[PDB]
């Protein structure tokens with residue numbers, strides 16, 4: 040039987056993320072002999088991440104890119120895994136995603152209506168592009184940095200001294216052009232693909248978040264599918280995640296040079312003072328289970 044699945048994301052056509060969605064679509068199409076078809080909706084065509092997630096939860100045949108910081112809204116302990124400067128090594132992160140605590144969380148989420156489809160996308164390392172250079176935390180004072188509607192990211196930027204300004208990625212460009220905000224934070228490929236270099240000419244390599252992304256949909260939808268189809272969807276999704284773990288990194292030199300050609304200065308910074316301020320967020324979540332952060336660090340190594 041033919042199954043169509045809408046795939047919603049904020050990234051624009053040609054971004055590495057969009058390329059990996061094409062990989063996934065082709066992989067799944069081939070495994071299923073054309074019976075399972077992904078319909079791609081880049082550039083926030085289906086609206087905001089939080090809204091798309093709600094539609095999925097009611098049973099719409101849609102998935103969206105997301106992360107554990109968003110999912111913390113539904114399962115609070117997941118928030119710790121989106122914390123700043125957790126590690127610079129993707130391999131360590133993926134140990135937690137592959138471990139039994141994350142499995143338990145993923146099963147909890149199903150009962151809440153949320154089905155993780157792809158658990159292993161390497162989104163990149165999040166940097167900041169801004170209208171004035173950020174070399175020290177002191178430079179962030181007075182700056183309105185856009186962040187997603189993600190509690191951990193909001194608290195992270197507050198702890199470092201900025202004024203976080205949350206909004207969906209699809210609204211960010213005009214806010215930056217108008218000076219409502221004066222910076223944006225994201226992996227360099229996403230910053231470039233969203234054209235923020237037209238409005239901001241300083242890129243600081245704070246590297247505050249080594250970023251894993253998830254594809255998520257609604258359990259009410261996925262539980263209706265036969266086992267053989269679910270297997271093809273999960274396997275092809277995992278393949279795509281593995282592809283992202285090569286492509287995202289491979290794209291680095293190319294993206295650095297494109298930024299330079301657009302007149303953006305790439306700034307290496309002393310990361311330690313940013314990290315020292317950001318680390319305070321780990322004691323700002325009273326709803327976390329006791330010992331959560333310690334357990335996470337123990338699993339990372």
Ligand SMILES: C[C@H](O)[C@@H](O)[C@@H](O)[C@H](O)C(=O)O
Nearest residue numbers: 104105106162187208225252
């Ligand atoms: C995987 C993440 O949720 C991204 O989709 C999100 O950070 C996005 O790049 C944004 O900046 O809103």
Ligand SMILES: [Cl-]
Nearest residue numbers: 087088089188
């Ligand atoms: Cl949102």
Ligand SMILES: [Cl-]
Nearest residue numbers: 187188206207
């Ligand atoms: Cl958002």
